[PDB]
Amino acid sequence: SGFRKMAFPSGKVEGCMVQVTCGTTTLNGLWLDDVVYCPRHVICTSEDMLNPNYEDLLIRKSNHNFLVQAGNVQLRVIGHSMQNCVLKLKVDTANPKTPKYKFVRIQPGQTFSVLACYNGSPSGVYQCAMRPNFTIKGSFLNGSCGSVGFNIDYDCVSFCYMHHMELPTGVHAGTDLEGNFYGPFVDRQTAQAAGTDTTITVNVLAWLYAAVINGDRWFLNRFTTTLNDFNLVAMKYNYEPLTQDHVDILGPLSAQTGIAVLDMCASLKELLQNGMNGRTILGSALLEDEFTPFDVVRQCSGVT
Amino acid sequence: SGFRKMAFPSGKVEGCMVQVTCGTTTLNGLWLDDVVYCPRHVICTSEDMLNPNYEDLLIRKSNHNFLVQAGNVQLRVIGHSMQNCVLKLKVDTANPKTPKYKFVRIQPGQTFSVLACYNGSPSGVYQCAMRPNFTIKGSFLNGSCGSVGFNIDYDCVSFCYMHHMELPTGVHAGTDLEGNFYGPFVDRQTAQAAGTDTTITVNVLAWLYAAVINGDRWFLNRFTTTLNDFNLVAMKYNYEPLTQDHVDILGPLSAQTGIAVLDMCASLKELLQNGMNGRTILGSALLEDEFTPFDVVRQCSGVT
Ligand SMILES: Cc1cc(CN(C)C(=O)NC2CC2)no1
Ligand SMILES: Cc1cc(CN(C)C(=O)NC2CC2)no1
């Protein structure tokens, strides 16, 4: 029993983190096979970041200008290319700790673990969601650039995020491992404002199911609703619309608890309209939206 | 910027987890050098757990009755002993992934990371505190027994907790790595009720400092207080008494922010008396107490 904001064990990713330095800029790289992936930011001065022309800045850079250090051993760079907003540095040594891996582009509302790194060295691990406005709410200081987000399916690491930057509002933006930003963000130090950070409704519902499974039941009410009625209330409270696809995804939690998804929606509707009245659910005074239905099943079933 | 509930990178501990089976009971062991540490519970049936005599149960057990598997390779048990509530199984192979390590007994209010494991396999990592009633609020299913809690200082893992059991209230109790329970708990399936789960005041203050550093400042007020005045309010709200030792520990955060500790106490006093009025601090609607002053400095400074 008990329900925690749980990250994947980070060991497989720790084995992939390196330091990348270009001139005076140091950040983190991801070493998979004989390729180090890092933000193309590695080539900018902070001056450059106001209006960088990355193709033009990159002409001035040779293989030997990219210093890649794995622990306290230097890797030899034998090639480099820009793919979207990442650099791929070809090194002469395959990472011997390369796990089975994939590159995946996640959807908003999907959760993942972040291994926060500085100078190629892991500092901590925490669990994030891709927000509906394609930001994440991370913990990243200067030097954390190139830290990665990931899911693990048994022995396969799915890399979904690389950290590039902090918006003036102190929320975070980054890319998939093909170098494509999530959302409309660019790797330039300019006016970039996030859209509405809506609540990930299907995740809140999943977490309410987790609460019931773990004995927190006070919020269960005598009502039901419909998707259309619930969605009118969702819209008013800046919750994402709930679709039949979300209802289908919550089916196994519905089955395990015997609470119909639309009944849990009606409980959630009352919590939105009435508030918590100073009560807590799984030690929270707000409705948690950074657990997916898959996360709740995993943590409630003990998957390794 | 941003502030997350962050665990230590788990790789160094992942390398130490094994499966221990005795008869029909499987749980997790910690493999350091040529010793596997596991809950003495490994020898009980669930029937046994109602009133176990561990010395008597252990007479019936030989080295060959303890099955230790590291990945899919069996370790040879060449000796076994009971130390308090843990078994030490001597194996014929030193763990080649043994990190630098210490065994430490933490105080209430100290935080640590838990690597939740099942069948010797890591499932997740999350951050815990030793509660003032010597419980922890974990996420542990059947089979999670022997999962460990730890801190890391650069390259040295300090092991502070091993998971033994769940109280009927769904909170958790365990031992240090010498096999001594935190608090008054015993490894028997009996009436064990936790005392008052008070709030770790010095940790709340640390987290309010983290909030100020990260731009959440709305709760800063025009008041100050004294330790004695604050403590009258703390007692009323089931907060731990704040000592001058806690004030001293918060000194560096005081210095960094320029908010006197007693001023932050007065802000906290107003939050206790007035509530949050539906506002959040670092994305929380309650006062978080599972960050130590050391945690806040570490996460705010980017220590690896
Ligand atoms: C603060 C903060 C920084 C970041 C990522 N970033 C832009 C950097 O690390 N820049 C340094 C490496 C040249 N995210 O939040
Ligand atoms: C639920 C729950 C279980 C636990 C730890 N424990 C008692 C076990 O794993 N018992 C199984 C191994 C024989 N903590 O919470």
Curated annotation (Swiss-Prot), chains A, B:
It comes from the Viruses. Cleaves the C-terminus of replicase polyprotein at 11 sites. Recognizes substrates containing the core sequence [ILMVF]-Q-|-[SGACN]. Cleaves and inactivates human TRMT1, preventing tRNA guanine(26)-dimethylation of tRNAs. May cleave human NLRP1 in lung epithelial cells, thereby activating the NLRP1 inflammasome pathway. May cleave human GSDMD, triggering alternative GSDME-mediated epithelial cell death upon activation of the NLRP1 inflammasome, which may enhance the release interleukins 1B, 6, 16 and 18. Also able to bind an ADP-ribose-1''-phosphate (ADRP). The gene is rep. There is a cross-link at residues 5, 90 (Glycyl lysine isopeptide (Lys-Gly) (interchain with G-Cter in ubiquitin)). Changing residue 145 to A: Complete loss of 3C-like proteinase nsp5 cleavage. Residues 1-304 form the Peptidase C30 domain. 3CL-PRO exists as monomer and homodimer. Only the homodimer shows catalytic activity. Interacts with host FBXO22; this interaction promotes the proteasomal degradation of nsp5. Inhibited by pyridone-containing alpha-ketoamides compounds 13a and 13b. In turn, alpha-ketoamide 13b (tert-butyl (1-((S)-1-(((S)-4-(benzylamino)-3,4-dioxo-1-((S)-2-oxopyrrolidin-3-yl)butan-2-yl)amino)-3-cyclopropyl-1-oxopropan-2-yl)-2-oxo-1,2-dihydropyridin-3-yl)carbamate) inhibits SARS-CoV-2 replication in human lung cells. Inhibited ex vivo by michael acceptor inhibitor N3. Inhibited ex vivo by compound 11a and 11b. It comes from Severe acute respiratory syndrome coronavirus 2. It catalyses: TSAVLQ-|-SGFRK-NH2 and SGVTFQ-|-GKFKK the two peptides corresponding to the two self-cleavage sites of the SARS 3C-like proteinase are the two most reactive peptide substrates. The enzyme exhibits a strong preference for substrates containing Gln at P1 position and Leu at P2 position. The active site is at 41 (for 3cl-pro activity), 145 (nucleophile). Changing residue 90 to R: In strain: Beta/B.1.351. This is 3C-like proteinase nsp5. Residues 1-304 are cytoplasmic. It is found in: Host cytoplasm; Host Golgi apparatus; Host nucleus.
